[PDB]
Amino acid sequence: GINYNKLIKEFGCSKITENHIKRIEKLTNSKAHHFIRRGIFFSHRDLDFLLNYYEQHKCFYIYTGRGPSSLSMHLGHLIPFYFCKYLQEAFNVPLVIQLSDDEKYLFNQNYSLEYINTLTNENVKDIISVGLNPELTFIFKNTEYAGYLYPTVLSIHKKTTLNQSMNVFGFNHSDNIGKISYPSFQIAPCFSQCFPNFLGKNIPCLVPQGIDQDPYFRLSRDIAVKMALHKPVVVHSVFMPGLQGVNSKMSSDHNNSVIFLTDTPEQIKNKINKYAFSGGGTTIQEHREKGGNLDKDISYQYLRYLLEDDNKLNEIGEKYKKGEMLSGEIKKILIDVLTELVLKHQEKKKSLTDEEISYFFDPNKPSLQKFKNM
Amino acid sequence: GINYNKLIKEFGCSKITENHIKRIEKLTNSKAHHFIRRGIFFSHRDLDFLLNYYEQHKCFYIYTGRGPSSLSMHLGHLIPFYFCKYLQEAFNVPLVIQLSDDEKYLFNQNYSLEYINTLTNENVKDIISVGLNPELTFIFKNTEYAGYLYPTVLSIHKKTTLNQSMNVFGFNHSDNIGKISYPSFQIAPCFSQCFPNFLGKNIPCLVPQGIDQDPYFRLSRDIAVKMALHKPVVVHSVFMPGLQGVNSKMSSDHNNSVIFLTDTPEQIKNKINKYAFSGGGTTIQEHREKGGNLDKDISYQYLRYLLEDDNKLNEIGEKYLSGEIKKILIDVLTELVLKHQEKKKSLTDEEISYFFDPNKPSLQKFKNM
Numbered sequence: 060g061i062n063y064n065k066l067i068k069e070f071g072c073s074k075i076t077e078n079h080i081k082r083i084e085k086l087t088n089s090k091a092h093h094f095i096r097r098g099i100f101f102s103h104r105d106l107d108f109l110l111n112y113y114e115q116h117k118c119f120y121i122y123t124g125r126g127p128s129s130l131s132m133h134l135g136h137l138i139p140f141y142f143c144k145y146l147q148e149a150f151n152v153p154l155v156i157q158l159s160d161d162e163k164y165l166f167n168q169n170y171s172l173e174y175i176n177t178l179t180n181e182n183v184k185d186i187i188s189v190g191l192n193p194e195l196t197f198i199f200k201n202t203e204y205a206g207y208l209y210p211t212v213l214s215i216h217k218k219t220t221l222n223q224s225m226n227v228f229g230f231n232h233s234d235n236i237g238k239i240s241y242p243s244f245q246i247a248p249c250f251s252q253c254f255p256n257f258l259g260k261n262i263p264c265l266v267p268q269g270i271d272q273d274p275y276f277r278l279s280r281d282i283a284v285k286m287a288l289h290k291p292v293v294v295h296s297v298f299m300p301g302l303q304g305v306n307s308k309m310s311s312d313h314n315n316s317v318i319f320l321t322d323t324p325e326q327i328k329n330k331i332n333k334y335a336f337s338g339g340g341t342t343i344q345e346h347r348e349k350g351g352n353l354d355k356d357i358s359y360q361y362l363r364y365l366l367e368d369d370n371k372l373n374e375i376g377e378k379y380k381k382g383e384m385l386s387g388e389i390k391k392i393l394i395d396v397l398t399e400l401v402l403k404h405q406e407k408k409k410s411l412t413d414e415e416i417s418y419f420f421d422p423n424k425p426s427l428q429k430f431k432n433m
Numbered sequence: 434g435i436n437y438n439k440l441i442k443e444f445g446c447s448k449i450t451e452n453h454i455k456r457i458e459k460l461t462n463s464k465a466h467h468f469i470r471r472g473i474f475f476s477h478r479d480l481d482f483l484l485n486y487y488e489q490h491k492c493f494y495i496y497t498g499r500g501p502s503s504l505s506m507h508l509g510h511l512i513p514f515y516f517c518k519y520l521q522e523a524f525n526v527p528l529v530i531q532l533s534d535d536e537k538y539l540f541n542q543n544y545s546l547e548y549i550n551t552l553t554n555e556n557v558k559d560i561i562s563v564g565l566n567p568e569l570t571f572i573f574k575n576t577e578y579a580g581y582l583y584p585t586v587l588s589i590h591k592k593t594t595l596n597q598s599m600n601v602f603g604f605n606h607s608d609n610i611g612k613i614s615y616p617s618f619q620i621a622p623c624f625s626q627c628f629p630n631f632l633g634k635n636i637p638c639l640v641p642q643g644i645d646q647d648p649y650f651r652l653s654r655d656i657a658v659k660m661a662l663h664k665p666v667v668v669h670s671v672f673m674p675g676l677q678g679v680n681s682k683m684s685s686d687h688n689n690s691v692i693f694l695t696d697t698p699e700q701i702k703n704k705i706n707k708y709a710f711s712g713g714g715t716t717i718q719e720h721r722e723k724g725g726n727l728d729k730d731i732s733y734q735y736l737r738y739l740l741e742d743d744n745k746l747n748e749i750g751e752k753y754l755s756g757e758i759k760k761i762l763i764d765v766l767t768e769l770v771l772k773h774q775e776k777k778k779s780l781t782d783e784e785i786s787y788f789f790d791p792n793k794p795s796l797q798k799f800k801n802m
C-alpha cells in the first residue's frame with residue numbers, strides 16, 4: 060500500500076487538522092466538504108497563510124489541471140474537480156483549470172495534436188459536468204493560452220537547471236526537449252500574472268491535486284521565492300483506489316477495476332457486484348460473527364468519497380462493522396449512489412451547448428473580473 | 434582564420450554560383466545585390482527550389498532575426514537586414530523578423546526581461562532604420578508572439594531529443610532548460626502556419642543569416658521532413674570582420690574593433706585611423722613596389738560590403754596609399770551611420786507600431802496561397 064504519512068514527512072507537508080476545518084467553516088459560513096472531514100484531502104503547504112489572507116482580503120484563486128491522455132475520465136479524476144467545485148462555492152473565488160494538452164502530446168509518441176484535442180474537448184465536458192460555476196471558472200488549453208504563460212515560463216525556465224529538471228522528473232537524454240520543458244508550463248499558472256484579464260498581480264494560489272503532482276509544486280515553491288512571488292499553497296488528496304483493492308490507484312480485463320463516467324447503470328451494477336473487493340466474511344454466519352473490515356471493504360471506502368450525509372455513512376459503517384449489514388447490501392447502496400452520480404453526470408454532459416462550453420474559456424467575464432484589482 | 438570552404442563541406446551547404454545570380458536577376462528584373470555578386474552571401478541550401486517555386490507561384494516569404502543582447506547593434510548585425518531589404522524589394526514578398534528577447538533573457542543570467550526590453554525596442558528602431566518596407570514587414574517579439582508559435586514549437590520539441598539539442602548547440606547540464614528549449618522557437622517561424630493572419634499554410638521560407646545561425650536551420654530542415662512541411666531555404670553570409678584583422682568576427686577596449694551605429698563621426702574616424710588593420714607596405718618604398726594586399730586590408734574589405742558602385746570599388750582596388758583608402762572608408766561609414774541615425778531619430782511610435790501589425794492588407798497578399 061501507499062504509506063501517506065511517510066510521504067508527508069518525506070515531501071515536507073503538514074496534515075490538515077480539525078482546527079483548519081473549523082477555521083474554514085468560520086470563514087466560509089458553511090459546513091466543510093466531506094473530503095476534508097474524512098481525510099481524503101489530508102495534506103497541505105501554507106494553508107494557514109492562505110486562510111489568513113482570505114480573512115483580510117476576501118481574495119485568492121484556485122488552480123488545478125487535467126492531462127488529456129484518455130477519451131473518458133474515471134471517478135478518481137473527478138475528486139480534485141469536485142473539491143474545486145466546493146472551494147469555489149464556499150470561498151467565492153475564481154478557479155482556473157489547465158488542460159495540459161501540450162504535456163500529453165509531448166509524452167505520447169504516437170498521439171497527434173489533433174487526436175489530443177478530441178480528448179481535450181471531451182474531458183472538458185466531463186470537467187464542466189461536475190457542476191462548476193461558469194461565472195467563476197476559467198478553463199484554458201496550453202496549446203491556445205501559451206502566449207499568456209510564456210513570460211512567466213521564461214522566468215521559471217531560467218531558474219531551473221537541466222540537472223534539476225532531470226533529477227526531479229526522472230528524464231533521460233532520449234526524452235524530447237518538450238518533456239524537459241513542460242513542467243514550467245504546469246508551474247506557471249500558480250502566478251496570477253498569467254491571468255491579467257481577470258486577476259490582480261501576485262494573488263495567492265490554492266492548488267488542489269492528487270499527491271502525484273507534488274514534484275511540480277514543491278519545485279514551484281523554491282522558484283516562487285527566487286521570483287519574489289507568493290509560494291503556491293497546495294492541498295493534496297489520497298488516491299481513490301481501484302475496485303480490485305484499497306492498496307492501489309484507479310487508473311486509465313483492466314477496465315473492470317475502474318468506474319468510467321460513460322459506464323451504464325448495468326455496467327456499474329456488474330462491476331461492483333463482481334469485481335469490488337469485499338471486506339466481509341466469506342459466509343453469512345462468519346460475517347455475523349466477525350463483522351466487516353471497513354479498512355479493506357471497497358464499497359465502504361467508496362462511500363466515504365461519495366456519500367454526503369455523515370450520519371448515513373456512520374450508520375452503514377457501524378452496521379457493517381458489527382455484522383448487522385451484509386456485503387450484498389452495502390454493495391447495493393454504493394451501486395444506487397454511483398448510478399445516481401453517473402446518470403446525473405451524463406444528463407448534464409449531454410445537455411452542454413457549444414455556447415455553454417465556450418463561456419468557460421472566456422477570460423473577460425465580469426464575475427471573474429471582480430478580483431482584477433482586488 | 435575562419436575557413437569558409439571547410440564549413441560548406443562540413444555543414445553540407447552549396448556555394449551560390451553565377452548562374453544563381455543570373456537566375457535571380459531574370460526573376461526580379463533587377464541587378465542582384467552586391468553581397469551576392471561579391472561573395473558576401475556565398476552559401477545556401479535549396480536555393481534552386483526556392484527560385485523555381487517563385488517562378489511558378491510568385492510567392493514565398495523571408496525570415497530573419499535579431500537577439501537583443503546589446504543596446505546598439507554594429508555594422509555586422511545589419512548585413513542580413515540590408516540583404517533582407519533587397520530581397521523584399523526585388524521579389525516583392527513578406528519579411529518576418531523575430532526579436533529573440535526570450536533567448537537573450539535566458540542566456541544572460543543578470544539580465545531581467547525589463548532590461549532586455551529596453552534593448553529590444555532600440556534594436557527594433559535600428560532594424561527599421563535600414564529602410565525596410567513597412568507595408569511588407571512583420572516584426573514580432575517572442576515574449577509577445579509565443580502563442581502563435583507554440584503549436585509548431587511543440588511539434589519541433591517532440592522531434593528533438595535532449596541529446597540532439599545538447600550536441601547541436603553545445604549545452605551542458607548546468608544550463609537552464611530555457612536555453613535547451615529556445616532553439617525550437619528560433620526554428621518555428623520557418624513554417625508559415627506561425628503567421629495565420631497573413632500567410633497561407635506551408636509557404637516556402639527564405640532564411641538569410643550569418644553562418645553562426647546554421648546549426649538551428651540545418652536542424653530545422655531535418656525536422657521539416659518529419660513534420661511533412663517544406664524545408665527552410667537558407668542563404669549564409671560570411672562574417673564582416675572586426676577592425677583588428679580579417680581573421681575575425683565583429684562582435685558586441687574590445688569595442689575598438691567594432692563600428693556601432695551609435696558611434697559619432699569623431700569615433701568612427703579614430704577607430705579607422707588607429708585600429709583598422711592596414712594591408713599596405715610597412716615602408717612607403719615597399720608599398721610602391723608590392724602595392725596593397727587587398728585580402729588583408731580591412732578598409733578595402735569593408736568597402737566590399739558598403740560601396741554599391743562596382744566601378745568605384747574596382748578603381749580603388751586597382752590603385753591600392755593606406756591613409757587615403759582609410760579616409761574613403763571613413764567618409765562612407767560616416768555617411769551610412771549619420772543617415773541611419775537621422776532615420777532612427779525620426780521614427781514615431783505610430784511608425785514603429787505599424788511594423789508589429791499582422792493585419793496589414795499589403796502583408797495579407799499571400800494569405801490565401
Ligand SMILES: Nc1ncnc2c1ncn2[C@@H]1O[C@H](COP(=O)(O)OC(=O)[C@@H](N)Cc2c[nH]c3ccccc23)[C@@H](O)[C@H]1O
Nearest residue numbers: 123124125126135136138139157159268269272298299309
Ligand atoms: N485515483 C485517483 N484518485 C484521486 N485523484 C486522482 C486519481 N487519479 C488521478 N488523480 C488526480 O486527478 C487530477 C488529474 O490527473 P491527470 O493525470 O490528468 O493530471 C495530469 O496529467 C497533470 N499533469 C495535469 C495538470 C496540469 N496542471 C495541474 C495542476 C494541478 C493538478 C494537475 C495538473 C490530478 O490532480 C491527479 O492527482
Ligand SMILES: Nc1ncnc2c1ncn2[C@@H]1O[C@H](COP(=O)(O)OC(=O)[C@@H](N)Cc2c[nH]c3ccccc23)[C@@H](O)[C@H]1O
Nearest residue numbers: 497498499500509510512513531533642643646672673683
Ligand atoms: N560580423 C557579422 N557579419 C555578418 N553578419 C553578422 C555578424 N555578426 C552577426 N551577424 C548576423 O547578424 C544577425 C543577428 O545577430 P544576433 O547575434 O543578434 O543573432 C541572434 O542572436 C539570433 N539568435 C537571432 C535570430 C532569431 N531568428 C533568426 C533567424 C535568422 C537569423 C537570426 C535569427 C544574424 O543573422 C547573425 O548571423
